[PDB]
Amino acid sequence: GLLPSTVLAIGYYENFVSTVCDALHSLPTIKLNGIEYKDFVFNIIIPNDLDADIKRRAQIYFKKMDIHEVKIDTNGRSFPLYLQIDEENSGDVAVLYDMPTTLGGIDKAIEMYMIGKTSQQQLLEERELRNFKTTLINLINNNSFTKTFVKVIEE
Amino acid sequence: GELGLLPSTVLAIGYYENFVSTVCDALHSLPTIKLNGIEYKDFVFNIIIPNDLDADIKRRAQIYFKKMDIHEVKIDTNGRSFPLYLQIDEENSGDVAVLYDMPTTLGGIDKAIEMYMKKGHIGKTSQQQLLEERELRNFKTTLINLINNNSFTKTFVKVIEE
Numbered sequence A: 001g002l003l004p005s006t007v008l009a010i011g012y013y014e015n016f017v018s019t020v021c022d023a024l025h026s027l028p029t030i031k032l033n034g035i036e037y038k039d040f041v042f043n044i045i046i047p048n049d050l051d052a053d054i055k056r057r058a059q060i061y062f063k064k065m066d067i068h069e070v071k072i073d074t075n076g077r078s079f080p081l082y083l084q085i086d087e088e089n090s091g092d093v094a095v096l097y098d099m100p101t102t103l104g105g106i107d108k109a110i111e112m113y114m115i116g117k118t119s120q121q122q123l124l125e126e127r128e129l130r131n132f133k134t135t136l137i138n139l140i141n142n143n144s145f146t147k148t149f150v151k152v153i154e155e
Numbered sequence B: 001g002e003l004g005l006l007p008s009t010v011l012a013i014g015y016y017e018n019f020v021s022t023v024c025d026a027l028h029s030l031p032t033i034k035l036n037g038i039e040y041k042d043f044v045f046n047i048i049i050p051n052d053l054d055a056d057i058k059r060r061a062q063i064y065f066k067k068m069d070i071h072e073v074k075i076d077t078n079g080r081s082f083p084l085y086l087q088i089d090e091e092n093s094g095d096v097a098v099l100y101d102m103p104t105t106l107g108g109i110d111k112a113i114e115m116y117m118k119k120g121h122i123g124k125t126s127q128q129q130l131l132e133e134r135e136l137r138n139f140k141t142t143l144i145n146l147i148n149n150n151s152f153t154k155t156f157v158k159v160i161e162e
């Protein structure tokens, strides 16, 4: 019984999480926005609901938390990926953030196969956010190039 | 019935919302479209939908781009949210830039169905390959309906076969 949240989590893991960790794992020395790091953590922000659109929401979170854009050029044919870095207090570890824009799909999808967000629809979009977070945590913990390097957190 | 919203439906929406209309919006915005230094008078954006999920999507796409002699191109330029990487036919594009992409999102259906299979087999079962089949068809139908229901994509994006 495949939940959409489950496919989306796997899509985001294979095509974004792994791709980013690999890019950073392939640099002899990690150098982000021209400062050298000895290690990294990659924080996946799960939103608490789908009331605000994810791109709008993420932008608010990153401004609020004063963390700024950084492009990581992938070690494949030079394709930079987009994410946010918290460059604070001369830390050795590069503390990176993303909020999965793929979650947008769930809001639009739910609101398209249904005015006012019913507690029934709220409990449905709640269930998907948790299923996505749970799948994602499982996938991360199941590969040595992602485990210890990736954190799934709440907004 | 509990919402029978297929995964392929949500993935097709996400691809449309966060990629197809992001690309069109970047090209519609350009006073003149300039790709790898070339001016184009308009564009068409072709979404290659794979016939199956036998081959991994990125392996597949490489094969299609290489067999079509299509080339890498960077769009959205700079300081426009984030840059995008596409494939263009520099050989047969005149006034119209012909752009390609194979949805990498389709890659999540394979690995998902492969996870949820309750046993290991040499290759794949007929039933397994039936689910893949009908999920790719739903994605194409969902994308074609999304594309056609908007001025900003309707003439500009086309779903093609591998």
Ligand SMILES: Nc1ncnc2c1ncn2[C@@H]1O[C@@H]2COP(=O)(O)O[C@H]3[C@@H](O)[C@H](n4cnc5c(N)ncnc54)O[C@@H]3COP(=O)(O)O[C@H]2[C@H]1O
Residues within 6 Å of the ligand: A011, A012, A015, A016, A080, A081, A082, A100, A101, A102, A103, A104, A105, B014, B015, B018, B019, B083, B084, B085, B103, B104, B105, B106, B107, B108
């Ligand atoms: N370059 C990138 N920049 C930022 N986040 C990235 C990313 N590549 C992947 N992700 C994240 O991973 C999700 C799944 O990516 P996937 O490649 O499987 O599926 C993607 C992919 O097929 C396409 N797409 C989106 N952004 C793309 C990009 N910059 N280049 C190429 N394809 C992109 O649209 C699908 C849905 O994207 P969506 O945002 O809904 O959801 C994306 C997004 O949340």
